[PDB]
Amino acid sequence: DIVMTQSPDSLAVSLGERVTLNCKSSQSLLASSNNKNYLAWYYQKPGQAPKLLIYWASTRESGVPNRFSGSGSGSDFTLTISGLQAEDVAVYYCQQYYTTPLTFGGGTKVEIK
């Protein structure tokens, strides 16, 4: 099937400065017909149901402020933060929704150092 591999396992940084994260795909998720690409970047808190952050591999969800950016097309994808908050330091996820079975990423647990 389609293997979704996140490149770091964790990222413990300070608060205020930007970070960046990556998710590689074993298969090019760029739909040639729609010319638009298929990533769901999710955010799960400890003990909470997750929520969407990035849909169509680039576009932020309503309720999410301007400090996130889903970026990249083809096979390798990048979630770039611009400013870290205390509300943000929990697990991110990358998801392909191009085919069945729907597979997720490994989950990069970002916390505060």
Binding site: A31, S33, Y38, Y55, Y97, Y98, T99, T100
Partner: protein, 132 residues
């Protein structure tokens, strides 16, 4: 019978779904049917085979009632000696892969009736314009 869903819904995706549900995605297989020192000859004859097959199918449509409808209705009735089964047990039970085998023998009997009814409807239309 279409709803909100974010998955790709791609080529031959609903091949195993029932034929009342694969009919809601027919523009996908219609779209992905045409565009895709010696080997250029092989590639080139493959491309002209593709466009020749597309033209043959569009010509079979065009001499019938529908030329660009992609769902069209006609005036020949379903002879019940062909499939002898209920309407409820085709659109909710079987697939096109399974319905293809069950009328493959009665195929080419149907196509002549389609051309016959379309030629008769064309001459009836010409006479109806002509009497006015």
């Amino acid at each position: 019978a279409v709803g909100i869903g974010a998955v790709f819904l791609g080529f031959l995706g609903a091949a195993g779904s029932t034929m009342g549900a694969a009919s809601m995605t027919l523009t996908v297989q219609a779209r992905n049917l045409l565009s895709g020192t010696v080997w250029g000859i092989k590639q080139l004859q493959a491309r002209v085979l593709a466009v020749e097959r597309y033209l043959r199918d569009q010509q079979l449509l065009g001499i019938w009632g529908c030329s660009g409808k992609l769902i069209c209705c006609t005036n020949v009735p379903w002879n019940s000696s062909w499939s002898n089964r209920n309407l409820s047990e085709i659109w909710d039970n079987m697939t096109w892969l399974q319905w293809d085998k069950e009328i493959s023998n009665y195929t080419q009997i149907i196509y002549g009736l389609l051309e016959e009814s379309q030629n008769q409807q064309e001459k009836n239309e010409q006479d109806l314009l002509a009497l006015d």
